[PDB]
Amino acid sequence: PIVQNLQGQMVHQCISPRTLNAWVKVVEEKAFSPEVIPMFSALSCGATPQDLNTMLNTVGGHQAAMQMLKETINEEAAEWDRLHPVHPGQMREPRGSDIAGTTSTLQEQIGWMTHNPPIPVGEIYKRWIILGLNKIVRMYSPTSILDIRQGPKEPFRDYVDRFYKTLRAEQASQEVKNAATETLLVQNANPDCKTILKALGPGATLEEMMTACQ
Amino acid sequence: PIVQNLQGQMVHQCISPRTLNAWVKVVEEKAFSPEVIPMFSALSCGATPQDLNTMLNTVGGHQAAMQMLKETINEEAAEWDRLHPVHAGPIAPGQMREPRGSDIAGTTSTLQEQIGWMTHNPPIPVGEIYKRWIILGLNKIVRMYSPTSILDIRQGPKEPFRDYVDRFYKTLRAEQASQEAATETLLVQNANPDCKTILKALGPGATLEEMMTACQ
Amino acid sequence: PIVQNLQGQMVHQCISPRTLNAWVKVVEEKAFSPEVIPMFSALSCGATPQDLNTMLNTVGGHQAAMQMLKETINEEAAEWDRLHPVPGQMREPRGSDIAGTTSTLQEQIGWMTHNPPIPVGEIYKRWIILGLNKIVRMYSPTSILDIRQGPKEPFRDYVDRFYKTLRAEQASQEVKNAATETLLVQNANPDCKTILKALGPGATLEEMMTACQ
Amino acid sequence: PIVQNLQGQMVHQCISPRTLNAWVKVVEEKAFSPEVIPMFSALSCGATPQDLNTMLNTVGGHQAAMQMLKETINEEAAEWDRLHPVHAGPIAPGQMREPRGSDIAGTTSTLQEQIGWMTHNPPIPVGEIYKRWIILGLNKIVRMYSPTSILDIRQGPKEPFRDYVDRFYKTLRAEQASQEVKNAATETLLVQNANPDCKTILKALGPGATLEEMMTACQ
Amino acid sequence: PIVQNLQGQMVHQCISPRTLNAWVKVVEEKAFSPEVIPMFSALSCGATPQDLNTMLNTVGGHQAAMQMLKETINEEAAEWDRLHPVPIAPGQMREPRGSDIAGTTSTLQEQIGWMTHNPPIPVGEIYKRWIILGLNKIVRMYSPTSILDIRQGPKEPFRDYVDRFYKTLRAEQASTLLVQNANPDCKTILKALGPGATLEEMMTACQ
Amino acid sequence: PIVQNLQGQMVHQCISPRTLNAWVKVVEEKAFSPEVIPMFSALSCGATPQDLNTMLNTVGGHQAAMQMLKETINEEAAEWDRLHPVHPGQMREPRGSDIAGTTSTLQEQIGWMTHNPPIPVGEIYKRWIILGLNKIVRMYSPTSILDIRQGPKEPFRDYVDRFYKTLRAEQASQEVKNAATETLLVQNANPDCKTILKALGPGATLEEMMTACQ
Amino acid sequence: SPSGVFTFG
Amino acid sequence: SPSGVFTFG
Amino acid sequence: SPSGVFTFGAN
């Protein structure tokens, strides 16, 4: 990554063994559960394109997902090349494959990221990666929100946990999520809870609902 | 977070893997037992709003609690916008704008804006404001996940008094989401007959230490 | 805590995840065995009152002990307020300021780094250790009078139990020495007691332990 | 390795216990699975030739592979001496010399010479040159030790399509020691080795379909 | 401890959680096997007397040994006062007594003052020397076996016998014979080597 | 160890708990397999003699090996004194026991190591220790190269792994190692593989041989 | 097109 | 009043 | 005397 030194300069620092292992282990343990993406984003704070490629390439399994991710990256790089076409001791301009770190050197990446003004190629690349990861997370979601119904003996809290875990993985637009909350959540509670909740009437907060059915 | 470097300057530093993992693991292991709140507060020392959101977003389970927290945050942000409105209008080149609620929550503000606010003289402490909102929501979660009412904590026939007091104040802490006359009345009232006799003999104003010595 | 930077200045540093976890784990593993207090003291080196409160509040169980500790703290804070009564100027800390409940982090730093320093962190730590001493003594499982060498217990294991109990009981050094001088030999098993009597008093513990090995 | 200190100066730093242990452990756990190579590359960020040799020498097993690696290294050093020859002659003592292949591999150079080259202006990156040679050798080992041919990866009658694609591209990565292995031949083969039902759906999609579209179609 | 910072000045630094835990764990796992003492010495590099006392006080078990150590410390402090006998001038450094070196009558700030004075008064290193003397006595006491009880088994490989021998010797020493206690075959070969043979040669001969 | 500070000074730094524990564990886990020596050498980067003695003395088992090591050290110190006889605020010259850290103080070791020109007593002593460790590794090799023979069902790769691991521990000259590679490797392959390898003809490379029996 | 999984911020 | 548990120092 | 075990590098 790029970090600030005591002289106020932004300089390169080697990716750490702790970071490398933390990412490898989160992919091993969580696969593509949604919380993998925020962790990726946090572990790649300040990353160069080289660092981001290191993190992706150190993953051993899930090569279907990793190939899909490559496809997404290449699509975003092609769009970059469409919007920013390119033409001696001077800084050249990055093409799509330069931002993705396959045709650029570390020193060029540092040059772009520390230039005044900066071309934040690490952050651009990270955006593309998260786009692909989002597609993977949604595809690997095991459950549809329509199949989440509170069991006759299931505590309401456990039902809500399942409901919003599913919603998070499915990644619908906020209007459709809101529709699901206003229509499906109470609709699919079990009869007793559903009675209590409907008695609470709309506009009740999730906290009020959960207290009522505890 | 924003920390002082070795020459006394306030600079941004990436959240560390150790911190990230510590928070994830405490949520996995303790859920929303009360002591998770002080841990949250310590692990987010100097955090920007971006860091606070990273910590909340890396939690995998407990999505009901996370939705409740999101609602508490949005309520506090709305109150911020009502009581500390930002004059709408032009942008001043090179000049610090004032944060609205969604800026403090890190949704409409950039990391660079957050750093600018937190290191200004005087500082606009958007990290600490957001953290206050988050802790408000988390305390609501702790209270809701409390399994037992204090009225149901009664000393067992053979239960040592120390164990009963442990259960008593464990329960009170969870039910209030805080460790701070009715309560002492209740402690003696629900002690078992022998202990209750001894404690009532001690009279009012006896300390917990004196009560525990008396019933040992 | 407060640490020294390269400018020779005393500045605040966030408590580390390693410190937090270390303290939580020592309480989980050791409860209120005596060695928990030196560990507390070592893990809170340079701590502010805020940091000390973080360490205490992250403890999940043992809430009877934690409430007793809190009562000890409040007593010490009242004594401080009795003995030390209270624009752009630095105010004086009252007891709840030293205990970190009515003071801000910035005020605590101001006091701890002032010239001359008002060492509120060390004052509060003293109060906490007073309370912890009382808890360790109270929670001691065994009385020194009940520590007696078993017929087949090695003398070393008996002496280990003897002095662990003595450490938890926290009597004056004169009372401890009186125990060493009478109970230790008195309560050894018959054979060891014979040898230890043949050596006589004023033999060192090393000599006693070699004699019964 | 060579790192920038807090004041912007390039200085030598001892290789750390965490790095040493991480490399030993990844070799022990993963052997020569392809993802070991990016890990190697990352754990040796800023390494001198001396550090690279430490990492290689701390490996306990796989000693046949280490002999092959040593031979690749010698080949690359010879190519360096062919394409970057050093004029022979008396060499003034106490002055920076030009590195030959055996200097880059750390066999005839001292740590202090390596530091001198790597911190020169401009730097002579003997560590990165050597690492390229090492990774070339390691990639040859990865391909040699790949257990299965891509031709033998075929979807089972009840195997979910996702698991088959996982197996397919894992195998391809090992056989090429590279993920940049997607071509028309490969997608052809992925559909060809699919099971009858999935194969029918995939052939109905036609060519030019993305992997995401293929996987959605057979879900 | 007292350490040099990145700019070359001697400054106090809190003992670290890693150090604290390392010492507690080595005592828990190894007790008073001899190799515990070099570990102690390394973990207390730069220690003030206060740090040394922290390390000793965090030990939970072995309270008999801790009492023996305390007695050794007091004996050494008494000898110090016998060999270095000592109100104070305002704002001036006083001289350490034995109990100052052991950290019982001195403050952290006084310890720092002595250790960073020019020339330094190395109270931490003096105290550490006393502690290690006591620890050596404890190691010798916890040695389970006498060197006389280390005899080569009838079918014991010579290497395993030598390992046991020198393990025992190390513990018993803390505060010719190898051959004599070898079994008959090995003993014959070894004496056949004659005198002046190295351990390497002996072990090769009986391999 | 001795480290560089920000003033460009070589200064003493305490050995770390991580280094100490790493060395203890590598000896516990690997004993005197050959790879223990490069690990030692890497973990003692910048070591003073005092640090080297700390690393050796914290080892609990293996006291036969540690005594042999002590004897090699004493031999090298005696040779140092034979080759470098040593006849008020002035720096004295180190004798062998000073280099081995038994008669020198830490401050004297720092003085020698940071002097201009430096007397690198840490590196000299480490060289002696590694001479001793080399003799221990050779002595503790469990099997002779003559006894490494491919099993009827042993993959050729596993046989060659055993062959070269033994060869590494035995530490013969390169000429002697090459002689073993040229005669024994093929001679002691199992019948089928040996037939294939002999069909290759003389002068076959290791890569060729391993491919041929794959 | 998926909306992402960053519930907060 | 308890004497404390700091055996050393 | 033994040749050492440093397969790579200066020995």
Ligand SMILES: O=C(O)c1ccccc1-c1c2ccc(=O)cc-2oc2cc(O)ccc12
């Ligand atoms: O309450 C305050 O101290 C305050 C006063 C003026 C502006 C903001 C705050 C304020 C905070 C100031 C400092 C701080 O550390 C935390 C604060 O939290 C706030 C939360 C609010 O909802 C609303 C306001 C605050």
Ligand SMILES: O=C(O)c1ccccc1-c1c2ccc(=O)cc-2oc2cc(O)ccc12
């Ligand atoms: O990249 C090159 O081909 C090159 C050109 C001039 C000097 C060195 C190199 C070169 C390298 C330059 C920078 C770098 O980081 C790595 C290099 O690796 C090389 C490897 C070679 O076998 C042969 C050459 C190189």
